[PDB]
Amino acid sequence: CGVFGIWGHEEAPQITYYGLHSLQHRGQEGAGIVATDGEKLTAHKGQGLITEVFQNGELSKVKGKGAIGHVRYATGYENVQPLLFRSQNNGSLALAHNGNLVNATQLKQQLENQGSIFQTSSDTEVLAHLIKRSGHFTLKDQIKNSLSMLKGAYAFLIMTETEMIVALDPNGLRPLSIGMMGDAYVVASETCAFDVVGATYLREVEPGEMLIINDEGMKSERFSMNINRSICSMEYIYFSRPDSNIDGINVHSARKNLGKMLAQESAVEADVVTGVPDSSISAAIGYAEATGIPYELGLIKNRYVGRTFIQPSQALREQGVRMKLSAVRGVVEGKRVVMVDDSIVRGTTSRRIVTMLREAGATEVHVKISSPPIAHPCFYGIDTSTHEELIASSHSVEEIRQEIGADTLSFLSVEGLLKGIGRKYDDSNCGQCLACFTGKYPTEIYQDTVLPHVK
Amino acid sequence: CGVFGIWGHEEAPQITYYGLHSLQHRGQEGAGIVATDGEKLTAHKGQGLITEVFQNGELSKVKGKGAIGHVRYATGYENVQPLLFRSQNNGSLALAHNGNLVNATQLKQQLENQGSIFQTSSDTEVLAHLIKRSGHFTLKDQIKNSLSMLKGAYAFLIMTETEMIVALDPNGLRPLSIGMMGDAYVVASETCAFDVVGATYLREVEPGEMLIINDEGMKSERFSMNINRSICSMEYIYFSRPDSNIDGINVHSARKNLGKMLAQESAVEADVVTGVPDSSISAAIGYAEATGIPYELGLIKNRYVGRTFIQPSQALREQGVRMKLSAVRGVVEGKRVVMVDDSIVRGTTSRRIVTMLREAGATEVHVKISSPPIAHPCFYGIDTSTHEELIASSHSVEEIRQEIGADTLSFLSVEGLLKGIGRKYDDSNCGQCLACFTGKYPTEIYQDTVLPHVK
Amino acid sequence: CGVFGIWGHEEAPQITYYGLHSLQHRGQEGAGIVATDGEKLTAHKGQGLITEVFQNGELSKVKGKGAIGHVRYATGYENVQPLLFRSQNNGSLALAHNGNLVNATQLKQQLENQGSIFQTSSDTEVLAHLIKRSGHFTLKDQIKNSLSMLKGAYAFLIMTETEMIVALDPNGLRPLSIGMMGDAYVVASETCAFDVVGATYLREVEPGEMLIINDEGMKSERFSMNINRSICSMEYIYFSRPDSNIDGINVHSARKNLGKMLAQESAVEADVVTGVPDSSISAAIGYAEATGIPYELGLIKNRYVGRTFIQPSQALREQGVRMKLSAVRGVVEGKRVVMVDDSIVRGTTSRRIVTMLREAGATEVHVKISSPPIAHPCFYGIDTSTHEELIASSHSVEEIRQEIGADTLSFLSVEGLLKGIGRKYDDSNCGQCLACFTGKYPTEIYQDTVLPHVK
Amino acid sequence: CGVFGIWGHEEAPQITYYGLHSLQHRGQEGAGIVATDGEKLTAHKGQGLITEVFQNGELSKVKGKGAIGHVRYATGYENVQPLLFRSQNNGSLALAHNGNLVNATQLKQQLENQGSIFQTSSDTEVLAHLIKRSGHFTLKDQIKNSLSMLKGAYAFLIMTETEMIVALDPNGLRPLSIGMMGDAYVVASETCAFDVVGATYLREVEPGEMLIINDEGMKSERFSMNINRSICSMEYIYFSRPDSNIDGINVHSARKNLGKMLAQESAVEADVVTGVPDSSISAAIGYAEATGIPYELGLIKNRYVGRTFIQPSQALREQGVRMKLSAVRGVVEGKRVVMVDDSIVRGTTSRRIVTMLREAGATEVHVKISSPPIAHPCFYGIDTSTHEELIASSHSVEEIRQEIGADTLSFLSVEGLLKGIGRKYDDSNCGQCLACFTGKYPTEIYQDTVLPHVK
Ligand SMILES: Nc1ncnc2c1ncn2[C@@H]1O[C@H](COP(=O)(O)OP(=O)(O)O)[C@@H](O)[C@H]1O
Ligand SMILES: Nc1ncnc2c1ncn2[C@@H]1O[C@H](COP(=O)(O)OP(=O)(O)O)[C@@H](O)[C@H]1O
Ligand SMILES: Nc1ncnc2c1ncn2[C@@H]1O[C@H](COP(=O)(O)OP(=O)(O)O)[C@@H](O)[C@H]1O
Ligand SMILES: Nc1ncnc2c1ncn2[C@@H]1O[C@H](COP(=O)(O)OP(=O)(O)O)[C@@H](O)[C@H]1O
Ligand SMILES: Nc1nc2c(ncn2[C@@H]2O[C@H](COP(=O)(O)O)[C@@H](O)[C@H]2O)c(=O)[nH]1
Ligand SMILES: Nc1nc2c(ncn2[C@@H]2O[C@H](COP(=O)(O)O)[C@@H](O)[C@H]2O)c(=O)[nH]1
Ligand SMILES: Nc1nc2c(ncn2[C@@H]2O[C@H](COP(=O)(O)O)[C@@H](O)[C@H]2O)c(=O)[nH]1
Ligand SMILES: Nc1nc2c(ncn2[C@@H]2O[C@H](COP(=O)(O)O)[C@@H](O)[C@H]2O)c(=O)[nH]1
Ligand code: SF4
Ligand code: SF4
Ligand SMILES: [Mg+2]
Ligand SMILES: [Mg+2]
Ligand SMILES: [Mg+2]
Ligand SMILES: [Mg+2]
């Protein structure tokens, strides 16, 4: 999921459309914008892409000087964010979340026992309920208080008629950054949103920090003095857009260095290096460049394989009909190929890619993954978690190489990964979460905790 | 436009969906399939993408053992091909064209003076009328006769209840190839269609050749003994998909060598090489690889900028809101950049790209084009032609350079182009049309001839 | 089908929208408007209702000072009229037909043997082909000549850049009338269109007459000196809108008199008179009024049973789920009911209505039909013809009574019908066609002649 | 709004579709069904008509043995009912309301001060919140308790996995009735739903009664011992379907007697009586029948003037383009006309109708309304309330006549209204609410009370 907010701009909702658009890759299962003129909050949101949602429901209707918007990844319209709430006497509150609350089950029951009704399936709503059923005089304080009860990953955009309030979990598991458009303030899951809308980078939101932005500026305030830096590794490996800089480190560049690292760890002798569009192009470029083997487009992703697309019958696929990707035998025929991918999860893609490549007449396929094996669940986002079984969880690397049918299989080591990304922080893992590789989670996982999809 | 036919396959219409899908890049302004069981011809076709056309109108309805399908590029439903015609006594005829008939105006008047009514704007219809108002006993012959009266570029798919008939203009200006799916025969504008559906390459259809395919096989027959090989250069430079092999030469590989050629002609000293997604990625890879400068993603194309997408107000764009592309300052900031593009037409894109790149903090932009300047009209397809004025037609490489704002600007020479593609044919231009560069057209252009868009 | 044209009005296409709208009942299977400014012809047309076609495709795009429009009844977007044809040297022609050409098969072959290609399934196209392949210098003359070769029912609207041309078959089987909007001329299948758009009635187009309307006025010209008046009876009984006056006789009033006639022929003793909405409301009002029995709404038609509507499973219908109509037991329970309907065709509706009425607790059902039995095919329109078998064609009135389950069944006699409508022409059937009752067709029916649906 | 529930039927959701369909006239601004198999509650709902909602979202998905459905009138998807609520431990609750809670503002603040979040704008949600934040052990009791805190009009359908619970406000302002389908129980706003789905009438739900229906039957329980019968008069005059029997009195028959009453109060000498389709057809029939003047269709409502329909420019309307209705001059030309309408609100319709009728050449128009003037707000439904100003509130009868331009204007007296409906309940107004005529409301209207639209 991706979130974008901006405060202090005539066309805040348009900017949000564009910002949110640049984050559209974060998920395409819904989208929404809520905007404020100072008096009223306007809002349109729906399922599907941002474009399926607007000009299928007018962007003109939503008007304001501040807005927050959310792009939802999904595994019901009630769940499409931002969530907006109105009240008789106390005005309005819109909220948008990226992450996952690892104690949400707990809190829902407590809040339900206190008499809260839940209408969505979102964590964002839980935050809404804590805020309401909170003692403090001010919202700033209701929020600070509520935040400190949440466990897990969360980047939160919240706004009312008069302010925008931004908060990041004290591990800073998800990225969140701040930018300037003149005097406007902009806040986005990824920096690419800034590039796209004309915003200048300012800095990251600090884990455990909270920003209150309004017509007289921005103020920062802690809500968790002790912080334990562990940003999601997959943001770097896979999930963010390559033009984004996570913490000033560019995602393309990082992923390319992950390729150089792979080349230094497990070089093999070969004729062409291909990436997989679009997950592992930057790794592949980096790998080829390190080894001296030429980078080729040995695999093509069909640009138009949306949800509209009719799946070939399984019998057709046996026949050889491709769906999303195919191997270019124009390029690989008679070559021995290094196929670089960002990661392996189920293993199903790499097996398929190895098979197509051989069916295009590659003589060797050497699969090289720019991540350590993925053997543990994620609990910090629906986007990053999965219900699918993990191959790395039960198969050794060699057991895996046999399953995908590669000639060789190589994963980046953890040091390689950490070294490749080049993150500066002082501890044995550079302020990154590595839970899904190592099994060592940066927050406690309770026994009532459900997997993000399980909601 | 792109055309796909297959004869001898239970699921000919499904295969055509998938084949046509792989050619979807050829144009998205309409699409259609016509299929035959041996008795009746079924057909669904509409405007928009293949997916907007199917599951918006059922693919299940169209059933057969042969089908031909067309994907239309455009600058009205009546014009979406294939064109299907029925008759009381003489059964049916479906026709699909890719190319442009440089004498269509002439023929229309003659056929109109003979009492033909025209209901579409397509060249395909002209062929239908010549066939009908033709003397010969058989269709094969009516077609051969009709064909010989056409001037220009044309790949034709034609079919009836009982046969499929394929024909290519005797210059072979557009590609057309044949493949096998078991015993089925398959014919497509590009080979990538074969890759995608499980077809094996057989050969190209010969310029001036005509194929008749039916339940007992395929037969070839000339309709123009003297042929003059001049395949569209842009198919190689720009227009085909990179996994396609035009005449056994792979389009990715070719375009990459065009990069190597650029590097040998006009190397400059720089820090990063970027392509433009997706037009000039392969050129860029090749250029970087030749020069030793690192390949980076210094430009990103937003994946979701469909026709649904709301254009930023011109005032917003002045503000810095991007549409389709943006420059990654995460990558270029402080670097001197070689920006490789396939071609320049209006010049408007390259100017923009140069500006964004400088706004992302690139210190130098060196624009290097993997084509000779484009200074003459195309007359051999709506896809390849344009109503926009050509910058290269009135500006020296210098006045252009100044106009896009590049530090340097370099076009591939013609020899470089010919050498890069590396066609082996014996004549001064390797069996390629270079008309839009050189002004020397491979067919005669009459005075009544309209530009392809003018229809 | 219904046709509307107007010449000499800034907003001719809007007027046509509205005119066509008032004729929407004529059929809902497509619709189109073609308009001219004097230079170019603009045109939008599609399948479905006029509103599904406009604001699903803009009315703003079609602009002009004359337009013709068509509303199509159906049992292909190629078939939606008007048909528009363009040419290199000779400008444009749009044509719209209401009726059916009883020799169309003949003509198509002849025109096909002369080398015409047919792209639609419409009669309108045949006229287009005769006009083109016609010897005379002027269009007026080409049309007159072409017309005289047509056999059957036809009201034609035709127009070019400069004129509108209107023609009615020399039997005047379909209505067609002329009106004035200021200085504009208006032509419509039904007069209700005039009421709706602010047009004044002028007169009927004479059977075998042809109008040429242009910027200097209207001129009349015969194309068949000998005429034989036989207007479709169903236009009066059923098919036209009740606010329309066919030949100055109002359709409501006529149908009501048909009710008075029924009352004079076969009065029965009963408690309530119900019509069937909406086919036989006026008849029912008239019947009740004659007999003195009270008019009630003993049947209700659900206003929202469009094509979107999910048909109840046949098992549900056995359970008692209704679709379009139901009987009001609030009104009929314990009463003996006269149920008046305009006509019987298959018989399936009257049986159902009799059953529902008995299930609402009516003690008697007396079915009284304001038309003679329908025992012969129609050949003069798809609207008026049917592929369904005619009950009256094989069943005596008695049998039909037994089949619908009525207590009594009564059809209007032919004299009653003729007397009720009240037309004053001097011949044994008052200038009406009674073919589907009597079997005596007012034009010759050839052996190659297909039923209007068979196309 | 209209509500339909049925318990104990394999196809409960289909039946609900059909039942809801028959209540579609109640409003077309949304629709929804929730169904239960005993374990899970399934639900589809959306904006627009029932058919726009289903087969645009599958009815097959929603399955069960009980269901409740709602059809919403509106002047958001969040507001489309039924409202469905789920919980971790306590299962599910769906609720649907028809009516309006005249103290909802009060209760929302109280519930908001107790920490409730409100996500819809509906009264239905308020009931949901009272139920949750209620002390009692059982739901039956939580509801009874919650109900007793509501002020205003309310018919409520509520259901869970195991039961259906129905309740009517102790004034019985909205109709609600019970029927049988074999052993199934059916509950609907109007009886016409029963007719349509094959249900037998059982009785009305008693004002202040509550039904609990489950797999072992139905049980009744009061929640307000003292009841004060005042059913909405407009249900009879206008709002219900003519085949519905409100409290055993048929709505057609009643409205017809309202015509007889009008005829007895203010007969005038005239030539034809027309109603207005479809609001005042039954009144008109009754009037004509009383006076002996013939009933004619002097006005026609265009059947296809949906929300899709393009409104004629105001300039066109000045020209004489009609929208929904037009006058039949075929019928009224030269006649003096009694135009009977159910009611007058703004007065805008009657003025228009009088004008069209004169433009069709009626010599006199005598407007006769089958309701007392409407001079006071409604507070008991969005359907029945309006934001438009009431003409009768500031204009004397004779001042309205001048405004609509009638020759004469006549309202039914209150006695006439009461007498016509035939009602005899032992009080001065027969158990009907007459608030919008008299100003004497049957419940107290608080100072915080907003007009139903104001939400
Ligand atoms: N506009 C864009 N340009 C380039 N890369 C992008 C863009 N948007 C997202 N991405 C990248 O796409 C990658 C995944 O692409 P995709 O092929 O859809 O993934 P996968 O094949 O694994 O399902 C991500 O790792 C991300 O960096
Ligand atoms: N599925 C695909 N994968 C990669 N490249 C593709 C694909 N389909 C088409 N192309 C390529 O895209 C290029 C043009 O992409 P695009 O960015 O849309 O062009 P442009 O930016 O010039 O308008 C073509 O030169 C073609 O080779
Ligand atoms: N706007 C209208 N108002 C009243 N009657 C109309 C209107 N439009 C068409 N009609 C009438 O509707 C009748 C048929 O209505 P419908 O119930 O659809 O026919 P059927 O039930 O036989 O299929 C026609 O006989 C025609 O006169
Ligand atoms: N299927 C139906 N058949 C007949 N009358 C109906 C039907 N459904 C609703 N009605 C009636 O329609 C009347 C209003 O019709 P309409 O013309 O839409 O109202 P109005 O013109 O006042 O806006 C109501 O008074 C109601 O009794
Ligand atoms: N790690 C990861 N990879 C993903 C995700 N979604 C798609 N992918 C892609 O899926 C690949 C592995 O797919 P799998 O092995 O499960 O078939 C990775 O290369 C990556 O490109 C996700 O959420 N996480
Ligand atoms: N030559 C050519 N380039 C095209 C066409 N359509 C899009 N392009 C793209 O447009 C670029 C030049 O755009 P322009 O200079 O006209 O603004 C080329 O790099 C190519 O990527 C086309 O039909 N022909
Ligand atoms: N005569 C006739 N009736 C039609 C037509 N379309 C619908 N109807 C209706 O169908 C009724 C008879 O239906 P059927 O007996 O075929 O079931 C007539 O009352 C009329 O209301 C048509 O084209 N012709
Ligand atoms: N009383 C009433 N009439 C309504 C309503 N909606 C539509 N109408 C119609 O509107 C007519 C009066 O329209 P008006 O005078 O406001 O222009 C009544 O005859 C009735 O047919 C409603 O909610 N209440
Ligand atoms: S477990 Fe893996 S995917 Fe999840 S936050 Fe940590 S690094 Fe990211
Ligand atoms: S046969 Fe019957 S339906 Fe046909 S034109 Fe004659 S009267 Fe009309
Ligand atoms: Mg990948
Ligand atoms: Mg390019
Ligand atoms: Mg009828
Ligand atoms: Mg009314």
mmCIF file of N, CA and C and ligand atoms in Angstrom, chain B residues 73 234 237-239 276 278-280 341-350 374 382-386 388 391, ligand 6:
data_model
loop_
_atom_site.group_PDB
_atom_site.id
_atom_site.type_symbol
_atom_site.label_atom_id
_atom_site.label_comp_id
_atom_site.label_asym_id
_atom_site.label_seq_id
_atom_site.Cartn_x
_atom_site.Cartn_y
_atom_site.Cartn_z
ATOM 1 N N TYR B 73 -4.046 0.145 -35.413
ATOM 2 C CA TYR B 73 -3.459 1.395 -34.927
ATOM 3 C C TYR B 73 -4.362 2.496 -35.468
ATOM 4 N N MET B 234 12.013 1.113 -39.667
ATOM 5 C CA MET B 234 11.478 1.411 -38.367
ATOM 6 C C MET B 234 11.005 0.189 -37.669
ATOM 7 N N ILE B 237 14.133 -0.461 -35.934
ATOM 8 C CA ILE B 237 14.611 0.609 -35.075
ATOM 9 C C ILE B 237 13.699 0.793 -33.831
ATOM 10 N N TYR B 238 12.423 0.572 -34.022
ATOM 11 C CA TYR B 238 11.430 1.081 -33.115
ATOM 12 C C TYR B 238 10.163 0.195 -32.993
ATOM 13 N N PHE B 239 9.587 -0.183 -34.122
ATOM 14 C CA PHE B 239 8.202 -0.562 -34.169
ATOM 15 C C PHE B 239 7.926 -2.001 -33.748
ATOM 16 N N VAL B 276 15.393 5.232 -22.926
ATOM 17 C CA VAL B 276 14.043 5.688 -22.652
ATOM 18 C C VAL B 276 13.116 4.479 -22.683
ATOM 19 N N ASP B 278 9.846 2.624 -23.326
ATOM 20 C CA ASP B 278 10.553 1.393 -23.651
ATOM 21 C C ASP B 278 11.188 1.436 -25.007
ATOM 22 N N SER B 279 11.070 2.582 -25.678
ATOM 23 C CA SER B 279 11.450 2.695 -27.071
ATOM 24 C C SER B 279 12.929 2.383 -27.267
ATOM 25 N N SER B 280 13.808 2.756 -26.334
ATOM 26 C CA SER B 280 15.241 2.707 -26.626
ATOM 27 C C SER B 280 16.094 2.080 -25.588
ATOM 28 N N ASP B 341 18.092 7.374 -27.507
ATOM 29 C CA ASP B 341 16.716 7.152 -27.954
ATOM 30 C C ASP B 341 16.737 6.510 -29.345
ATOM 31 N N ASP B 342 15.692 5.748 -29.664
ATOM 32 C CA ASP B 342 15.605 5.089 -30.961
ATOM 33 C C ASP B 342 15.565 6.064 -32.133
ATOM 34 N N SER B 343 14.847 7.167 -31.964
ATOM 35 C CA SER B 343 14.574 8.037 -33.081
ATOM 36 C C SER B 343 14.081 9.388 -32.576
ATOM 37 N N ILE B 344 14.046 10.349 -33.486
ATOM 38 C CA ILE B 344 13.422 11.628 -33.229
ATOM 39 C C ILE B 344 12.471 11.891 -34.401
ATOM 40 N N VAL B 345 11.301 12.420 -34.082
ATOM 41 C CA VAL B 345 10.322 12.699 -35.112
ATOM 42 C C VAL B 345 9.951 14.173 -35.067
ATOM 43 N N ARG B 346 9.049 14.533 -34.158
ATOM 44 C CA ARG B 346 8.775 15.932 -33.855
ATOM 45 C C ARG B 346 9.883 16.613 -33.080
ATOM 46 N N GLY B 347 10.543 15.836 -32.225
ATOM 47 C CA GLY B 347 11.611 16.343 -31.379
ATOM 48 C C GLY B 347 11.123 16.707 -29.984
ATOM 49 N N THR B 348 9.825 16.601 -29.774
ATOM 50 C CA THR B 348 9.230 17.135 -28.584
ATOM 51 C C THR B 348 9.594 16.303 -27.356
ATOM 52 N N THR B 349 9.576 15.002 -27.534
ATOM 53 C CA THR B 349 10.021 14.101 -26.494
ATOM 54 C C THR B 349 11.467 14.294 -26.007
ATOM 55 N N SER B 350 12.394 14.449 -26.934
ATOM 56 C CA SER B 350 13.808 14.521 -26.567
ATOM 57 C C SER B 350 14.076 15.831 -25.823
ATOM 58 N N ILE B 374 15.011 11.783 -39.323
ATOM 59 C CA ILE B 374 13.821 11.462 -40.065
ATOM 60 C C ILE B 374 13.266 12.722 -40.699
ATOM 61 N N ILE B 382 -0.336 3.789 -41.490
ATOM 62 C CA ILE B 382 -0.775 4.833 -40.566
ATOM 63 C C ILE B 382 0.085 4.831 -39.319
ATOM 64 N N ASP B 383 0.461 3.624 -38.884
ATOM 65 C CA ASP B 383 1.329 3.451 -37.713
ATOM 66 C C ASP B 383 2.657 4.200 -37.850
ATOM 67 N N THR B 384 3.274 3.994 -39.013
ATOM 68 C CA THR B 384 4.578 4.523 -39.328
ATOM 69 C C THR B 384 4.560 5.970 -39.847
ATOM 70 N N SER B 385 3.454 6.402 -40.456
ATOM 71 C CA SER B 385 3.276 7.798 -40.891
ATOM 72 C C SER B 385 2.859 8.708 -39.719
ATOM 73 N N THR B 386 2.862 10.013 -39.981
ATOM 74 C CA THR B 386 2.434 11.012 -39.009
ATOM 75 C C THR B 386 2.019 12.322 -39.701
ATOM 76 N N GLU B 388 2.216 15.070 -37.816
ATOM 77 C CA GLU B 388 3.062 16.005 -37.107
ATOM 78 C C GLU B 388 4.202 16.406 -38.034
ATOM 79 N N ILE B 391 11.012 17.547 -37.570
ATOM 80 C CA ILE B 391 11.953 18.564 -37.147
ATOM 81 C C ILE B 391 13.177 18.445 -38.049
HETATM 82 N N1 LIG E 6 9.803 6.911 -35.284
HETATM 83 C C1 LIG E 6 8.738 6.793 -34.491
HETATM 84 N N2 LIG E 6 8.907 7.008 -33.212
HETATM 85 C C2 LIG E 6 7.720 6.885 -32.572
HETATM 86 C C3 LIG E 6 6.476 6.581 -33.052
HETATM 87 N N3 LIG E 6 5.533 6.576 -32.043
HETATM 88 C C4 LIG E 6 6.229 6.887 -30.990
HETATM 89 N N4 LIG E 6 7.583 7.097 -31.239
HETATM 90 C C5 LIG E 6 8.606 7.459 -30.304
HETATM 91 O O1 LIG E 6 8.729 8.858 -30.366
HETATM 92 C C6 LIG E 6 10.109 9.209 -30.246
HETATM 93 C C7 LIG E 6 10.222 10.539 -30.899
HETATM 94 O O2 LIG E 6 9.112 11.345 -30.470
HETATM 95 P P1 LIG E 6 8.995 12.862 -30.901
HETATM 96 O O3 LIG E 6 10.378 13.357 -31.236
HETATM 97 O O4 LIG E 6 8.116 12.934 -32.103
HETATM 98 O O5 LIG E 6 8.425 13.708 -29.800
HETATM 99 C C8 LIG E 6 10.881 8.030 -30.804
HETATM 100 O O6 LIG E 6 11.975 7.865 -29.873
HETATM 101 C C9 LIG E 6 9.981 6.831 -30.467
HETATM 102 O O7 LIG E 6 10.399 6.279 -29.200
HETATM 103 C C10 LIG E 6 6.309 6.321 -34.397
HETATM 104 O O8 LIG E 6 5.270 5.997 -34.994
HETATM 105 N N5 LIG E 6 7.528 6.453 -35.081
#
